[PDB]
């Protein structure tokens, strides 16, 4: 449980650092250098997180390994402007910056642990004997070699390549961290400072942020582990908005949703000079063949009946073949409805599809009242040539080949023509 | 990162066990016996979680320590009806129950590692020499003692007190676990079967459950670590209900405030010959680039459509650069909306921006329908030269350099274009 608590403390510290950072700061969760790598414009901040709730008092030996690791990293990267921070919690130690003296650092380099000597002290303090260097270079070391290396490092005085004074002055800071409960309290307070309510932070924002930190921590790729305050804020806001919309919906009935959509649709339908394109999947509407002609007749009687006022010809695009289009053309001609399909035989003509109908107002005559064609590449190109102002999609037809830029797309979810007529304000009540 | 992934895998496994368990099953997260302690009416199930994604092939040595601990616990608790289960994941091992033979267990008891011999093998296989017993009883053991114990346990044949056959037959089972992604998917599908929608599980329920598991895993008290499916379900349902109620209330109060503001703004928007200037901060409106063109098109359809009645041209000022203005101008050109910017390349022109459009009522032609430009000094001087009846500010743009004497200023507080269309009486209901 202690390891889990320490990992959660590290995650909370990373979240606090992300919240407290600016929009220009790049922070790497489980970074290459340390647990938290905050990359500013010119200074890179490396933070090591340690949790010692079970330790009554802080001891120098408790932090031997992280100090040796960061000293080795500084030795390997002395030319880089990297500031190493050690964030360790101790119940009986005052929260704040704790100074580490040069004598304490020298005491760390004199530790009798063989693992530290072989891993970090050897590189920090190179051995002056070639035999010791060869022994340290061995991948597998026997007990006799370990004892020899330990005795040599305990008895021999070796110079330190790492500039302890300059590093302690400029590139190192040691801070006693807050308690884990105080850590979550401070993190939630920072979350509240972003405009989020306390209840929202407690229920949604804090667990989501913790899960996000945990998910980014396990990614093997270092680049994918880089996050920022703006990205986290946007992710949380998007999750909140999606949850709000989903929970606002799914409670009402079909009639109320249809009425809301109808009121959403009415204003664009109350205009007499609007070009409207319909893309329909016949398999999503019950009894399409029997009621397609009557639907078009009612639509033309409603929105394309005034010769002087209605100046735009509606377009109907269907997910069918050409033979069904010819059958629909026959059924339209038999009812004194003038349409153009663009197809002559089985070939599409570009100039026969985009021509504007001629109007003779005195005799109340329009050459053709609607464009009805199929879902083909040529028709899609023709539609893209002359963009519409409203684009209604019925049945979830694939619209990847259309130019959706700067066109008002309005998806309609229906399963019969009565609902379609209700949505388009051709019926008063279903 | 591997340890974090393993801990997350353990959390997912115990969450899956909690979801799959019945309402009468008491499950202890981070239990006394193993990671998962499922306590039924008569049988207690102990589950040990291991993650070995980095291991190509499963090896017997990979499970030496868990099996030895399991055998030691069985020896100490043979009278208790505890079924010990091992849950480890290997990428190249088929998911399912894997049998462990008695010969394999005997091989585990013959491991040469000193730690295992001193901790578990010594108790499982007591030494027949009193010297070895005294050495094992020492709290601190020197290297010579460790070597002596290792040699004695390697060379001496010791009987096994633990009933290996009975343990393997009744109290032991080894199962190859699923992958971390597969375990997450199975847990979500279990939450899918609980009536919680997939989006709800992804956004709220799963992160909340993971946070709850993590919080219960760190509790020092064993009793506080006992959880059940019903408690988690009730906690999730209560959180969802409270959040939905709060979000509904927030929506209601926001709509009331917006309705009050709309009714405030209605009287001035019904005049057909009023000059209106807009100052917009793009960063304060979500999806500004993808929706700016449509908003202006609808605004011109509502307020600049009547050639003989609508005589004033709107002016839109943005907090952008000239290049973005050129891009917007291109997009307006592509949509057949005539606008002027006053810019030729990078040079502003006072006379090009201050001119009035020409009108031909017979042809229903206007030279340009809107003025769109950035908030440069020259543009603001042009605005100051010709004062407007109504000045609208969106996003709190600094208007300190404008001469706002005897100018009606209407600050608008919005965060998307739907709210703006509501305020300007372009939509009937949000």
Among chain A residues, the shortest Cα distance to B31 is held by A1
Which tokens in the block code for residue A361?
């107002």
Which tokens in the block code for residue A314?
């509606």
d(CA B320, CA B341): 13
Do B272 and B232 touch, CB atoms closer than 8 A? no
Q: Could you tell me which residues are beta bridge partners of residue A258?
A: none
Tell me how many degrees the CA angle A224-A225-A231 measures, rounded to the nearest 5.
90
Whether residues B243 and A200 touch (CB distance < 8 A) is answered with yes
Output DSSP code: residue B267.
G
The 3-class secondary structure across A329-395, one letter per residue, is HHHHHCCCCCEECCEECCEECCCCCCCCCCEECCCCEECCCEEEEECCHHHHHHHHHCCCCEEEEEC
Which tokens in the block code for residue A287?
């009894």
Among chain B residues, the shortest Cα distance to A181 is held by B215
Neighboring chain A residues of B301 at a CB cutoff of 8 Å: 271
Whether residues B3 and A7 touch (CB distance < 8 A) is answered with yes
Write down the number of H helices and E strands in chain A: 17, 17
Nearby residues of B270 by Cβ (< 8 Å), 6 or more positions away: none
> Number of Cβ pairs closer than 8 Å across A and B?
101
Report the residue from B218, B251, B428 with minimal CB separation from A8: B218
Neighboring chain B residues of A8 at a CB cutoff of 8 Å: 214, 218
Do B16 and B191 touch, CB atoms closer than 8 A? no
Whether residues A218 and B1 touch (CB distance < 8 A) is answered with yes
Element (H, E) at A397: none
Do B174 and B86 touch, CB atoms closer than 8 A? yes
Count CB atoms within 10 A of the CB of residue A189: 13
φ and ψ at residue A194, rounded to 5 degrees: -90, 5
Report the residue from B1, B243, B251 with minimal CB separation from A30: B1
- DSSP per-residue string spanning A65-111: HHHHHHHHHHHHTTTS-EEEEEEEE-TTS-SEE----HHHHHHHHT-
d(CA A218, CA B53): 12
Report the residue from A200, A207, A406 with minimal CB separation from B294: A406
Which tokens in the block code for residue B74?
């069985």
Do B342 and B399 touch, CB atoms closer than 8 A? no
Query: How many residues are present in chain B?
Result: 430
Among chain B residues, the shortest Cα distance to A8 is held by B214
Q: What is the CA radius of gyration of chain B?
A: 37
Tell me how many degrees the CA angle B84-B87-B89 measures, rounded to the nearest 5.
160
Report the residue from B3, B4, B246 with minimal CB separation from A199: B246
> CA distances (Å), A407 to each of A7, A390, A403, B287, in order?
50, 6, 8, 15
Nearby residues of A430 by Cβ (< 8 Å), 6 or more positions away: A255, A258, A418, A419, A422
The 3-class secondary structure across B341-389, one letter per residue, is CCEECCEECHHHHHCCCCEECCCCEECCCEEEEECCHHHHHHHHHCCCC
d(CA B380, CA B399): 9
Do A46 and A36 touch, CB atoms closer than 8 A? yes
Determined by which method?
cryo-EM
Report the residue from B1, B239, B428 with minimal CB separation from A267: B428
Whether residues A243 and B5 touch (CB distance < 8 A) is answered with no
Helix A2-20 and helix A180-192, axial crossing angle in degrees, nearest 10 = 30
d(CA A104, CA A110): 10
Count CB atoms within 10 A of the CB of residue B374: 20
Count CB atoms within 10 A of the CB of residue B157: 7
Interfacial residues of A (vs B; Cβ cutoff 8 Å): 1, 3-5, 7-8, 30, 143, 197, 199-200, 203-204, 206-208, 210-211, 214, 217-220, 239, 242-244, 246-248, 250, 263-264, 266-267, 271, 387, 389, 405-406, 408
d(CA A191, CA A201): 7
Whether residues B426 and A246 touch (CB distance < 8 A) is answered with no
Do A296 and A420 touch, CB atoms closer than 8 A? no
> Coil, strand, or helix at residue A149?
helix
Among residues B238, B242, B227, B304, which one has the least CA distance to residue B269? B304
Nearby residues of B135 by Cβ (< 8 Å), 6 or more positions away: B141, B145, B148, B149
Among residues A176, A173, A198, which one has the least CA distance to residue A187? A198
Q: Could you tell me which residues are beta bridge partners of residue B29?
A: B36
Chain A nearest CA to B425, separation (Å): 11
Element (H, E) at B302: helix B288-303
Do A89 and A50 touch, CB atoms closer than 8 A? yes
Count CB atoms within 10 A of the CB of residue B97: 9
Q: State the first-to-last Cα distance of chain A, in angstroms, to the nearest integer.
A: 61
d(CA A314, CA A303): 9
Report the residue from B143, B206, B244 with minimal CB separation from A247: B244
Do B296 and B316 touch, CB atoms closer than 8 A? yes
Chain A nearest CA to B142, separation (Å): 13
Among residues B276, B280, B299, which one has the least CA distance to residue B374? B280
Neighboring chain A residues of B199 at a CB cutoff of 8 Å: 242-243, 246
d(CA A188, CA A97): 23
d(CA B310, CA B20): 68
Neighboring chain B residues of A248 at a CB cutoff of 8 Å: 247-248, 251
- DSSP per-residue string spanning A307-330: TTT-----EEEESS-HHHHHHHHH
Whether residues B427 and A267 touch (CB distance < 8 A) is answered with yes
d(CA A84, CA A62): 17
d(CA A194, CA A233): 8
Interface test with A, best of B203, B298, B364 (most A CBs within 10 A): B203
Neighboring chain B residues of A219 at a CB cutoff of 8 Å: 1
Among residues B194, B184, B190, which one has the least CA distance to residue B240? B194
Whether residues B219 and A1 touch (CB distance < 8 A) is answered with yes
Give the alpha-carbon dihedral of B86, A216, A202, A91, to 10 degrees: 80
Among chain A residues, the shortest Cα distance to B203 is held by A239
Neighboring chain B residues of A5 at a CB cutoff of 8 Å: 218
Whether residues B428 and A207 touch (CB distance < 8 A) is answered with no
- DSSP per-residue string spanning B196-248: --HHHIIIIIHHHHHHHHHHHHS-S-TGGGEE-HHHHHHHHHHHHHHHHHHHH
Among residues B203, B204, B206, which one has the least CA distance to residue B186? B206
> CA distances (Å), B127 to each of A103, B66, B161, B377, in order?
48, 22, 11, 93
Interfacial residues of B (vs A; Cβ cutoff 8 Å): 1, 3-5, 7-8, 30, 143, 180, 197, 199-200, 203-204, 206-208, 210-211, 214, 217-220, 239-240, 242-244, 246-248, 251, 293-294, 297, 301, 331, 334-335, 426-429
Burial profile A52-80: b = 16 or more Cβ within 10 angstroms, e = fewer: beeeeebeeeebbbbbbbbbbbbbeeeee
CA A294 vs. chain centroid, Å, equals 46
The 3-class secondary structure across A230-259, one letter per residue, is HHHHHHHHHHHHHHHHHHHCCCCCHHHHHH
- DSSP per-residue string spanning A103-147: HHHHHHHT---HHHIIIIIHHHS--SSHHHHHHHH-SS--HHHHH
Element (H, E) at A279: strand A276-280
């Amino acid at each position: 449980d202690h390891t889990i608590k320490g990992f959660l403390y590290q995650f909370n510290k990373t979240l606090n650092s992300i919240l407290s950072s600016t929009d220009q700061d790049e922070i790497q969760i489980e970074g290459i250098i340390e647990d938290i790598d905050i990359k500013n414009s010119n200074i890179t901040n490396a933070i090591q997180c340690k949790y010692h709730e079970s330790k009554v008092r802080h001891n120098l030996s408790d932090i031997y390994k992280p100090i040796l690791q960061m000293l080795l990293h500084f030795l390997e990267n002395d030319s880089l402007n990297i500031k190493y921070a050690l964030y360790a919690y101790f119940p009986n130690e005052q929260v704040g910056v704790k100074e580490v003296t040069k004598s304490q650092i020298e005491e760390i380099l004199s530790s009798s642990n063989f693992d530290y000597i072989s891993k970090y002290i050897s590189k920090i303090k190179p051995p002056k004997e070639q035999i010791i260097k060869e022994l340290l270079g061995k991948t597998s070391k026997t007990t006799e070699d370990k004892t020899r290396i330990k005795k040599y490092y305990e008895t021999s005085k070796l110079e330190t390549i790492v500039d302890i004074d300059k590093f302690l002055r400029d590139h190192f800071v040691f801070e006693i961290g807050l308690s884990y409960e105080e850590l979550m309290n401070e993190t939630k307070n920072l979350l509240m400072k972003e405009g989020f309510s306390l209840e929202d932070v407690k229920d949604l924002f804090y667990p989501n942020s913790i899960q996000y930190i945990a998910e980014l921590s396990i990614l093997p790729e270092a680049e994918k582990r880089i996050s920022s305050k703006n990205k986290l804020i946007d992710y949380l806001k998007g999750n909140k908005k999606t949850a709000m919309s989903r929970w606002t919906s799914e409670v009402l009935t079909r009639k109320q949703l249809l009425k809301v959509r109808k009121n959403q649709l009415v204003p664009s339908l109350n205009i007499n000079s609007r070009s409207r394109y319909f893309i329909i999947d016949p398999d999503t509407i019950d009894n399409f063949d029997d009621e397609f002609i009557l639907f078009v007749k009612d639509y033309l009687d409603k929105y394309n009946s005034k010769i002087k006022l209605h100046t735009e010809t509606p377009c109907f695009i269907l997910k069918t073949d050409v033979n069904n289009l010819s059958e629909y053309h026959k059924r339209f001609v038999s009812r004194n409805i003038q349409i153009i399909t663009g197809y002559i035989g089985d070939t599409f003509y570009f100039k026969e599809f985009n021509k504007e109908p001629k109007r003779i107002i005195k005799d109340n005559w329009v050459e053709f009242k609607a464009r009805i064609s199929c879902n083909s590449d040529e028709v899609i190109k023709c539609i893209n040539y002359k963009k519409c102002d409203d684009l209604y999609i019925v049945g979830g037809v694939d619209v990847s080949l259309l130019d959706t830029a700067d066109v008002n797309i309005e998806n309609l979810e229906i399963n019969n023509f009565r609902e379609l007529k209700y949505l388009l304000s051709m019926l008063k009540e279903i």
